[PDB]
Amino acid sequence: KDKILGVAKELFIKNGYNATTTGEIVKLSESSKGNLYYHFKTKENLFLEILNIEESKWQEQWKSEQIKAKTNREKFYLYNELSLTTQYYYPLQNAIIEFYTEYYKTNSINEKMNKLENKYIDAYHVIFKEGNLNGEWSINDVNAVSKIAANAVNGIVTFTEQNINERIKLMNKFSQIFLNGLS
Amino acid sequence: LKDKILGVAKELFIKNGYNATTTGEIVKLSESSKGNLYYHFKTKENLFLEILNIEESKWQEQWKSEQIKAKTNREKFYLYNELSLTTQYYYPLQNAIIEFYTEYYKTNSINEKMNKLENKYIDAYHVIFKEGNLNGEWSINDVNAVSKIAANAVNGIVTFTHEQNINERIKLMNKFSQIFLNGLS
Numbered sequence: 001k002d003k004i005l006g007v008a009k010e011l012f013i014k015n016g017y018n019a020t021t022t023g024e025i026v027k028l029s030e031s032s033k034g035n036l037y038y039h040f041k042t043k044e045n046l047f048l049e050i051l052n053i054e055e056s057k058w059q060e061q062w063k064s065e066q067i068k069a070k071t072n073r074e075k076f077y078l079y080n081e082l083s084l085t086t087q088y089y090y091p092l093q094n095a096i097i098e099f100y101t102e103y104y105k106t107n108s109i110n111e112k113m114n115k116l117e118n119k120y121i122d123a124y125h126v127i128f129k130e131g132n133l134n135g136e137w138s139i140n141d142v143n144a145v146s147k148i149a150a151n152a153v154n155g156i157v158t159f160t161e162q163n164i165n166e167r168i169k170l171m172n173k174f175s176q177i178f179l180n181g182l183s
Numbered sequence: 184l185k186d187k188i189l190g191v192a193k194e195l196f197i198k199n200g201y202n203a204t205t206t207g208e209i210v211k212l213s214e215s216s217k218g219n220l221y222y223h224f225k226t227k228e229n230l231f232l233e234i235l236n237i238e239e240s241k242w243q244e245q246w247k248s249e250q251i252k253a254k255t256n257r258e259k260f261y262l263y264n265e266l267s268l269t270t271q272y273y274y275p276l277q278n279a280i281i282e283f284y285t286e287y288y289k290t291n292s293i294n295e296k297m298n299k300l301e302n303k304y305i306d307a308y309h310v311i312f313k314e315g316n317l318n319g320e321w322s323i324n325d326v327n328a329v330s331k332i333a334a335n336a337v338n339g340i341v342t343f344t345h346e347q348n349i350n351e352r353i354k355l356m357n358k359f360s361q362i363f364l365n366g367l368s
């Protein structure tokens with residue numbers, strides 16, 4: 001099972017969804033097409049199980065990391081920096097948008113992806129709701145500002161080889177510009 | 184000739200996407216051969232870059248025309264972002280571009296050319312801020328960095344916003360643009 005997932009993960013990271021064939025996963029992960037079935041049934045179901053795991057891993061990683069930032073202003077900066085460095089979730093965004101746009105008509109897995117989408121945004125909701133409570137800023141629509149922050153950041157992370165220190169400088173600058181736009 | 188292959192390839196990429204579209208399909212419908220395709224455009228991937236280049240030029244024309252209606256650079260920024268959102272919402276190639284990008288964002292040969300293309304969209308932002316600096320509307324130390332940030336952030340909002348209802352999508356882009364400029368001051 002774990003042999004199939006990891007190879008699935010990296011193949012999707014490198015080549016995206018469509019280009020990664022079920023056979024190529026079965027080829028490199030030394031297992032039958034019938035062994036992937038029963039465990040995962042279908043390639044789409046395989047993909048959703050990977051995203052479920054990725055969100056948890058990311059969520060746990062952030063659960064432990066946010067403790068390191070006192071104020072919510074710092075939690076924003078820090079969260080945004082981690083999204084660069086992390087190995088969870090953000091490296092699969094290309095595949096996620098590739099997968100999202102095809103199967104957005106099918107609601108069985110659309111709903112599931114909104115479920116996953118809500119949690120990836122909720123991190124920002126808490127940060128801004130908490131900032132409001134502790135007088136760090138004033139926001140009347142935390143939901144809107146959360147949606148914007150997440151996707152803006154996801155934009156910087158996905159679209160910007162590339163020097164890792166330079167990406168952090170750019171992200172810190174974004175973080176600065178955004179927070180001071182609230183103030 | 185070369186144009187008929189580009190013409191048909193766009194339609195196939197629009198109809199069926201990038202991955203499902205083959206070179207053989209493009210060939211037969213163009214009255215051509217795989218030999219000729221190879222000669223003009225080398226790979227399927229390079230053919231698709233030639234189409235995106237042509238599309239970039241059409242986009243540049245559209246911005247040349249539409250940007251005249253925005254007096255200040257501050258207003259050009261709002262409009263650029265909003266137009267990016269709206270245009271891509273009904274732009275047919277978008278799905279094919281998504282497939283291609285996600286497939287070739289890690290390939291040095293075609294990765295350099297993609298960067299060349301994306302940088303042209305980024306340069307629009309460079310004009311706006313530089314002109315804004317001169318015109319007294321703000322004061323930005325690193326125009327190069329801030330433009331990269333603006334562009335990639337805006338494109339994130341355009342690409343990842345899974346929430347339907349295009350009225351709200353405009354409301355959020357406008358709010359972003361407000362927040363972003365408010366933070367420059």
Ligand SMILES: CC[n+]1c(-c2ccccc2)c2cc(N)ccc2c2ccc(N)cc21
Binds near residue numbers: 297
């Ligand atoms: C959809 C084309 N496209 C890309 C793009 C995305 C992926 C690959 C190449 C270009 C783009 C990329 C960045 N960074 C910033 C802005 C834009 C952009 C802006 C407006 C538009 N109308 C199309 C745009």
